[PDB]
């Protein structure tokens, strides 16, 4: 269940908000495009006062669209329901051992007219061909998924469709806007028109392996694996004409297919020895990977029957399109590991790999990564020993490098696509390279061209990350107090990113580049206390606490200039934090005409507008004004896991949280302003009802205007709030039926349980609302509540 959401205007308040905007700007509130007729006036004070509102039953002078007060969120929202079962059975003789598993998951989405289901089967096994010499084995997993997905941000589109629109029109049609109401389509209708768009997904993945042990402590083994998936679906365009939302009469079908095929192969030999106070592992091996995916599609318009039984490409009359391409890459890797220990006190481990990627030239295809780690089990030192309460104590220290080549498969290439323009867009932007050169107006095949999608980078290399760990593992009092403390320093080199190109470079100026280095470092702490009191209560606590500072080190000037890492192009980021932002700083709002003169010449500064401090200290605002206003790094993050058992009852919790965190978001632009958007008369948050006005001051929230003359939607601190929180991830209470009688029915474990997920969050007062760890969203995560059982045998 969705348990909260951004509240939006009532159809009652939608008019209050407009009247207030109109009269704040000094034009007649009664000349609105949606009218909404008001009898207002003035108090003996000069100010305007709203006395009452009237809307005339239908939204037009024709009576096709009745007035409603729609809860567009409650309208496209269900209680979601999930059911799942899983049965699994294993058989272990010695000779070999097999396994088998069936299960099913089904999910009525929390969005209406949406669903999802999955069937799994797993079948694993091995065989001992020669009693301690040749094992052979296989793993296999088979999945089938079917879903109707919710459309691209509909909840977002439900929150800004005014409640004055109805769900159904006056015949019984799908309701929708009329006149000057915003060009937003009915979302409940969107969902219906979508309900038959269902994909079907099959995935096979597993491996076979041989393990051969030629003598004592040396064995070699190759495995081979594939992972094939396949998605097919048909999407239906049906014709709609709800209010001013027309399609005019478009029917189409698209039947699309996708195909992903990954295979992999390794071979690994290991030798290990054991000579009294001497232990060693050495391992050597290689592994190939290869993915080839690929997709295509068939499109046909115009169908004499509007049902998914008829809408197949064969039955289409109108025009048609065909789409599809494919891509792939291959990785190759060679590696070794060293393991050595003296007695059981001082341990050493070295690793070395050379990895190569399809994604690069060959000047930089391969790249070698080394690692060395070593510990010291101190409690095995005989001088220690006497303590005896101190159960264990190691002192670890690691240093290693690791690569990243997770970038586009065609990174290095200047890509030219023939894009003829066969494909949907919005408000233009075909970018289509096909033109009626002859001036014939068409009726035929136009001459086509090529077009650049990307510039190459034939000197692009791996992103190497250098990392250095040191920690202390401890266990105390008969292993009742266990934990760790470590510290990391991660330093990344030649960071891989896709870089939007400068403006005058024009079409497809983006390329994949390496742009410098970044620093990340901090501490971790783990502490568990597991005991059991006199009155028979097992308890096991295990919390965690962390902290880290991030620092951008070097950057190409162009890259630091264009604010991608990135100080908004007004200040470089080198020396600060990945994701730090420079902006204007809002010091409340002007509460009378005096504060406006008693403050720097600010372009659109009026009474009730937002007052931005001057940091020039030159008595004007301009654009140099700003400084750093946002920092993503938290003061520290923490987590604590609680297990309890008492009298067959079985209770577990998990708390996570973060404290001291800046958070920047756009949701206020829809909740504090009537005009901080690019489209007129969309529905707005519930809070701008308490904006500043003559009749209502000392409000933080600026007044209500029909246009953003003060540039309120500039990068400011208005949009940075406090994202401190403490989330209760999961709680789960269980009853386990006593084995003495769960065995009476040929069982062993028989337990029922109840559980919740995201039950509650604990948030700062300074936060506008919804989810602190998802500030960008107008709605929270959905709350799960589960009943279930386990059975044992």
């Amino acid at each position: 269940m969705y348990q909260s959401k951004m509240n939006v205007l009532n159809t009652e308040q939608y008019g209050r908000a407009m009247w207030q905007a109109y009269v704040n700007d000094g034009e007649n509130p009664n000349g609105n495009a949606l009218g909404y007729a008001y009898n207002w006036g003035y108090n003996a004070d000069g100010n305007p006062v709203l006395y009452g509102m009237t809307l005339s039953k239908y939204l037009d002078s024709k009576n096709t669209m009745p007035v409603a007060d729609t809860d567009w969120f409650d309208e496209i929202t269900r209680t979601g329901v999930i059911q799942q079962y899983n049965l699994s059975v294993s058989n272990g003789s010695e000779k070999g051992s097999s396994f088998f598993s069936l299960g099913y998951y089904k999910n009525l989405g929390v969005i209406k007219d949406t669903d999802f289901d999955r069937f799994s089967a797993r079948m694993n096994s091995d065989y001992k061909l020669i009693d301690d010499i040749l094992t052979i084995g296989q793993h296999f997993t088979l999945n089938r998924t079917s879903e109707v997905q919710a459309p691209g941000g509909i909840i977002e589109t439900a929150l800004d469709i005014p409640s004055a629109i109805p769900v159904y029109a006056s015949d019984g049609s799908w309701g929708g806007p009329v006149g000057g109401w915003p060009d937003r389509r009915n979302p409940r209708a969107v969902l219906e028109y979508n309900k038959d768009n269902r994909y079907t997904y099959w995935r096979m993945f597993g491996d076979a392996y041989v393990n051969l042990t030629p003598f004592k402590g040396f064995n070699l083994r190759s495995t081979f694996g594939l992972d094939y998936a396949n998605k097919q679906a048909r999407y239906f365009t049906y014709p709609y004409q709800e209010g001013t939302q027309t399609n005019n009469g478009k029917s189409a079908v698209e039947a699309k297919q996708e195909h992903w095929t990954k295979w992999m192969w390794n071979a690994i030999a290991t030798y290990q020895l054991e000579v009294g106070k001497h232990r060693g592992d050495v391992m050597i091996g290689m592994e190939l990977n290869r993915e080839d995916d690929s997709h295509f599609s068939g499109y046909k318009e115009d169908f004499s029957i509007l049902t998914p039984d008829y809408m197949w490409p064969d039955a289409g009359s109108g025009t048609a399109q065909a789409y599809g391409a494919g891509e792939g890459y291959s990785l190759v890797s060679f590696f070794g590991k060293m393991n050595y220990s003296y007695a059981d006190r001082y341990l050493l481990s070295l690793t070395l790999r050379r990895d190569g990627s399809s994604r690069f030239g060959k000047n930089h295809r391969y790249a070698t990564f080394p690692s060395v780690s070593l510990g010291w089990r101190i409690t095995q030192e005989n001088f220690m020993k006497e303590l005896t309460w101190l159960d264990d104590l190691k002192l670890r220290a690691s240093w290693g490098q690791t690569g990243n080549q997770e970038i586009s498969n065609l990174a290095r290439y200047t890509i030219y696509a023939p894009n003829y323009g066969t494909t949907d867009s919005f408000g233009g932007q075909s970018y289509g390279t096909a033109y009626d050169i002859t001036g014939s107006n068409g009726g035929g095949v136009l001459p086509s061209g090529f077009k650049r999608n990307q510039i190459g980078n034939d000197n692009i290399k791996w992103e190497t990350t250098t990392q250095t760990n040191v920690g202390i593992d401890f266990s105390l009092f008969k292993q009742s107090l266990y934990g760790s403390l470590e510290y990391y320093y991660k330093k990344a080199t030649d960071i891989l990113t896709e870089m939007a190109g400068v403006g005058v470079l024009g079409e497809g100026g983006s390329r994949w580049i390496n742009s410098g280095a970044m620093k990340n470092q901090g501490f971790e702490f783990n502490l568990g206390y597991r005991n059991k009191t006199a009155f028979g209560l097992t308890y096991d606590l295990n919390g965690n606490i962390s902290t880290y500072r991030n620092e951008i080190l070097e950057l190409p000037e162009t890259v630091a200039a264009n604010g991608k890492f990135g100080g908004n192009g007004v200040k470089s980021v080198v020396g600060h934090t990945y994701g730090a932002q420079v902006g204007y700083i809002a010091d409340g709002i002007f509460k009378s005409q005096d504060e406006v003169d008693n403050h720097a010449t600010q372009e659109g500064a009026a009474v009730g507008r937002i007052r931005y401090r001057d940091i020039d200290h030159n008595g004007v605002i301009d654009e140099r004004d700003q400084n750093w206003i946002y920092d993503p790094t938290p003061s520290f993050s923490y987590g604590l896991n609680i297990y309890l058992e008492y009298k067959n009852f079985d209770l577990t919790m998990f708390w996570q949280g973060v404290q001291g965190v800046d958070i920047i978001s756009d949701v206020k632009k829809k909740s504090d302003f009537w005009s901080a958007s690019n489209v007129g008369f969309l529905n707005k948050g519930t809070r701008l009802l308490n904006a500043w006005s003559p009749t209502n001051p000392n409000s933080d929230i600026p007044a209500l205007t029909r246009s953003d003359t003060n540039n309120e939607q500039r990068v400011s601190t208005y949009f940075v709030e406090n994202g401190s929180f403490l989330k209760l991830r999961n709680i789960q209470l269980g009853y386990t039926v006593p084995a003495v009688i769960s065995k009476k029915m040929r069982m062993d474990r028989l337990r029922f349980y109840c559980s919740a997920q995201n039950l509650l969050t604990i948030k700062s007062k300074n936060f506008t609302g919804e989810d602190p760890e998802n500030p960008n969203f107008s709605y929270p995560i959905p709350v799960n509540i589960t009943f279930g059982l386990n059975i044992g045998f």
């Binding site: 000349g31 495009a33 037009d60 000057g180 209010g243 001013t244 190939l288 399109q321 494919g326 891509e327 792939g328 291959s330 990785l331 190569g356 399809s358 295809r365 290439y413 200047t414 890509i415 030219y416 066969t422 867009s425 408000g427 233009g428 932007q429 970018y431 390279t433 096909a434 033109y435 009626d436 050169i437 001036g439 014939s440 107006n441 068409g442 009726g443 035929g444 095949v445 086509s448 061209g449 090529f450 077009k451 999608n453 190109g501 400068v502 403006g503 005058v504 024009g506 390329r511 000037e557 200039a561 604010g563 192009g569 005009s675 489209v679 008369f681 029909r706 953003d708 003359t709 540039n711």
Partner: protein, 552 residues
């Protein structure tokens, strides 16, 4: 296991090393053309019509002032931020057009003229297309980067400057391309989408005339009016050139903005919007998707201004009411009116684009804003609702060609130059205004019936071929442009050229604000608003190589 990583090749594309290949050259060339139909957005058409709501011709329209904020801010000259997306967009988009011309020229420069004999002729179209961008970029921004070394490697583009060239060198670099296209284009193009030698002359002209009105100080104010520049405009509007192409005026004014008459003698050069051409929904003119009227469901932008409407009034003798046109709203029963009104502005009680079954009204059906932006429809880009040339994609659009240079604009540029040269042939330059004015007097095919049906009084008369003061032939010339080119996005850009930007807008702001409350707090800042700011994000990425405009 080094073969292994090299086996997979890119799929469904051409790699950069092979684009330079000869057989793809004409591909590049056509692709450079296409982007003029496919590179634009409803919020940034290559007609610049959005940045003409600055002038006295038109309003923004829409649901209201909030519907499309950043453009209401341009309509009143207030609120325009150097960070606004609609300005960063139009900058980038136009420069994207230049990529394609530059890529094509990179191939063309290498072709061997033995086998590819049209080598120079194609180079021209591309250089002709490259100018079409820089030209619009100049009018919008003035301080523009000059992109013309098509052999620039991409990383050298971070070192470019929009002050490498003095303002007049920039106009010059724009002209140099059209200069090349004149010297190398053929006299006739069988494929109407290609420019002819006539058009490159007429664009070489329009360039030298924007250059003539010098702004050689640090600000956007006139610093004289160059004669050597004006003298070139005369050279390349020579009617002996136009005749080699068959280019002239059409029998009737309405034949330019109509599909049945695409590509006649006045379509000197046009973007060739086509349909039923195998693209997703047609290569329609999607950019004007907001300018369609509210009867199609949306959206009612690009509403003609009353001050444009009233400037189609005429006196009894048949001439403009130069000094009294705006004092009284046009009243159909009594005033005399220029026919050209009924091809520019669809007004209530009259038919919408010649279909007498759709009568424009004052209701939710025709004004999306219940009046706040008026009840006038643009007509020149819209088409017959019942046309077999009009589809609905995201918004509505049609196959109606966009004419970048009409021939009426080849004559009036020639009359303006002769009037500002003042050298005895000012009497010649009135007989050019007569050619345009006389044509409009008879453009009453399709609207002859309006006299008896709606009570209209057409009177438009050519001026007497006598002696006129210079500053008076500059009054008659500014007016012919006003009633010839309404809603055709030329208006404001003229004013700035004339250097009376500040005066005419503010005075139009005042007289118009009693009629349209959005204009009530407007105000143009002299030597700041004649151009758009260079977009913040473009300055910022140069790492200090780009210069701002004066006043920002």
């Amino acid at each position: 296991c080094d073969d292994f990583l090299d086996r997979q090749v890119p799929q469904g594309i051409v790699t950069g090393d092979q684009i330079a290949s000869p057989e793809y050259v004409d591909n590049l060339v056509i692709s450079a053309y296409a982007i003029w139909a496919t590179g634009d957005d409803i919020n940034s058409s290559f007609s610049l019509w959005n940045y003409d709501v600055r002038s006295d011709d038109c309003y923004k329209g829409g649901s209201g002032t909030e519907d499309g904020g950043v453009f209401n801010a341009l309509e009143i000259s207030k609120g325009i931020n150097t960070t606004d997306w609609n300005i960063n967009d139009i900058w980038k988009r136009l420069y994207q057009c230049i990529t394609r011309a530059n890529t094509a020229l990179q191939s063309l420069d290498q072709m061997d003229e033995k086998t590819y004999p049209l080598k120079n002729q194609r180079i021209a179209e591309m250089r002709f297309l490259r100018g079409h961008a820089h030209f619009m970029l100049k009018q919008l921004f003035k301080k523009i980067v000059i992109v013309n070394d098509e052999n620039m490697e991409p990383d050298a583009y971070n070192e470019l400057s929009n002050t490498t060239y003095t303002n007049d060198e920039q106009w010059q670099k724009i002209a140099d391309d059209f200069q090349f296209a004149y010297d190398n284009l053929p006299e006739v193009q069988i494929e109407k989408g290609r420019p002819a030698q006539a058009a490159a002359a007429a664009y070489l002209a329009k360039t030298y005339l924007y250059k003539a009105y010098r702004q050689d100080g640090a600000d956007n104010a006139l610093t004289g009016i160059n004669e050597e520049d004006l003298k070139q405009v005369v050279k390349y509007t020579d009617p002996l050139i136009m005749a080699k192409g068959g280019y002239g005026l059409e029998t009737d004014y309405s034949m330019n903005f109509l599909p049945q008459y695409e590509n006649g003698a006045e379509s000197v050069w046009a973007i060739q919007y086509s349909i039923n051409d195998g693209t997703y929904n047609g290569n329609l003119n999607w950019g004007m998707g907001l300018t369609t009227p509210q009867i199609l469901g949306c959206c009612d932008f690009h509403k003609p201004s009353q001050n444009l409407v009233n400037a189609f009034k005429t006196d009894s003798q048949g001439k403009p009411l130069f000094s009294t046109y705006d004092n009284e709203n046009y009243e159909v029963a009594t005033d005399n009116v220029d026919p050209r009104l009924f091809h520019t502005v669809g007004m209530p009680g009259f038919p919408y684009k010649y279909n007498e079954g759709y009568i424009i009204q004052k209701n939710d059906d025709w004004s999306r804003s219940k009046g706040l932006y008026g009840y006038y429809v643009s007509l020149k880009e819209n088409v017959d609702p019942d046309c077999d040339c009009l589809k609905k994609g995201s918004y509505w659009a049609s196959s109606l060609n966009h004419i970048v240079i009409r021939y009426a604009d080849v004559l009036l540029m020639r009359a303006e130059a002769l009037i500002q040269l003042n050298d005895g042939r000012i009497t010649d330059a009135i007989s050019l205004i007569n050619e345009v004015r006389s044509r409009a007097a008879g453009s009453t095919m399709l609207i002859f019936n309006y006299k008896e049906d709606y009570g209209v009084n057409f009177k438009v008369t050519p001026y007497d071929l006598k002696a006129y003061a210079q500053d008076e032939a500059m009054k008659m010339l500014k007016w012919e442009r006003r009633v010839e080119f309404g809603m055709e996005s030329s208006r404001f850009f003229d004013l700035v050229r004339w250097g009376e930007a500040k005066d005419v807008i503010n005075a139009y702001y005042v007289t118009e604000a009693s009629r349209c409350s959005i204009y009530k707090n407007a105000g143009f800042t002299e030597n700041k608003n004649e151009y758009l700011p260079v977009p913040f994000e473009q300055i910022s990425a140069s790492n200090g190589n780009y210069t701002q405009n004066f006043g920002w």
